Ligand binder design. Structure first.
Ligand SMILES: N=C(N)NCCC1CCN(C(=O)[C@H](Cc2cccc(C(=N)N)c2)NS(=O)(=O)c2ccc3ccccc3c2)CC1
Length: 241
């Protein structure tokens, strides 16, 4: 996260960290139930040197705050039993960049581990609404990741403007969130993480999945996120959630 600040410990109990066997933090995820997490599909694509699509190659850390303190009290470690990438995911356009990750064993709800609420299919996160992006990703484009979870406030951008800023790259499954001036934005390593939106009664709903961006925090290049409401039924059908 670029232009963010240290989050308070336990401030985002739904934020999860996904480590690949011997590679440390690779992507973020969100806890949505005792057994399921939501993340970005592009994080689980095999490459010639490593099988990122193999659930046994991952470890999820829930209730984590500092990457250098993965054993701290309250931090839960879990293995993945399965990775369900959206069938329509497109590695080239990044359309349908969303995945469901089944925990090998249930998360234990605590003050540091708690699911984020999921929005109904018909709900719309309005342009201009303040949203929170969190993650251990880079704090600067071409920089390095954060040890302490970072948080940043950004805003939903009008879909038409989004399409115009990134021509031939924005599908209806995507949504721009951030600022045209840049400054605050997600970045490498934040992919898979959730957008947290404070709703009418203070409860937090997931407004999207960190997916991609042209650089990080650049002017006129807000981050592109996978929308959530559009996948409510898909999540329910695949996880029972
Ligand atoms: N085979 C593979 N391992 N492929 C990995 C592809 C890529 C997917 C998403 N990523 C990004 O979009 C980054 C960083 C980023 C991540 C999330 C949000 C934002 C944001 N600005 N809000 C920025 N953006 S970039 O313009 O620097 C870039 C794009 C595509 C690339 C392809 C290959 C190598 C480097 C790349 C960098 C990181 C990695």
């Amino acid at each position: 996260v670029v232009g963010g600040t240290d989050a308070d410990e336990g401030e985002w109990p739904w934020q999860v960290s996904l480590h690949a066997l011997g590679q440390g933090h690779i992507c973020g995820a969100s806890l949505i139930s005792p057994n399921w997490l939501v993340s970005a599909a592009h994080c689980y694509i095999d490459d010639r040197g490593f099988r990122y699509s193999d659930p046994t190659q991952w470890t999820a850390f829930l209730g984590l705050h500092d990457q250098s303190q993965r054993s701290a009290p309250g931090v839960q470690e879990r293995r993945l039993k399965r990775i369900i990438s959206h069938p329509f995911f497109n590695d080239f356009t990044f359309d349908y960049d969303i995945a469901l990750l089944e925990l090998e064993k249930p998360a234990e709800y605590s003050s540091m581990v708690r699911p984020i609420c999921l929005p109904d299919a018909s709900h719309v996160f309005p342009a201009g609404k303040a949203i929170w992006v969190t993650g251990w990703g880079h704090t600067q484009y071409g920089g390095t990741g954060a040890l302490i979870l970072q948080k940043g406030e950004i805003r939903v951008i009008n879909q038409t403007t989004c399409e115009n800023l990134l021509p031939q790259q924005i599908t209806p499954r995507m949504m721009c969130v951030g600022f045209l001036s840049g400054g605050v934005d997600s970045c490498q390593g934040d992919s898979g993480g959730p957008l947290s939106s404070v709703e009418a009664d203070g409860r937090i709903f997931q407004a999207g999945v960190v997916s991609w961006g042209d650089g990080c925090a650049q002017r006129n290049k807000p981050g592109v996120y996978t929308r959530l409401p559009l996948f409510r039924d898909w999540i329910k059908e695949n996880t029972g959630v």
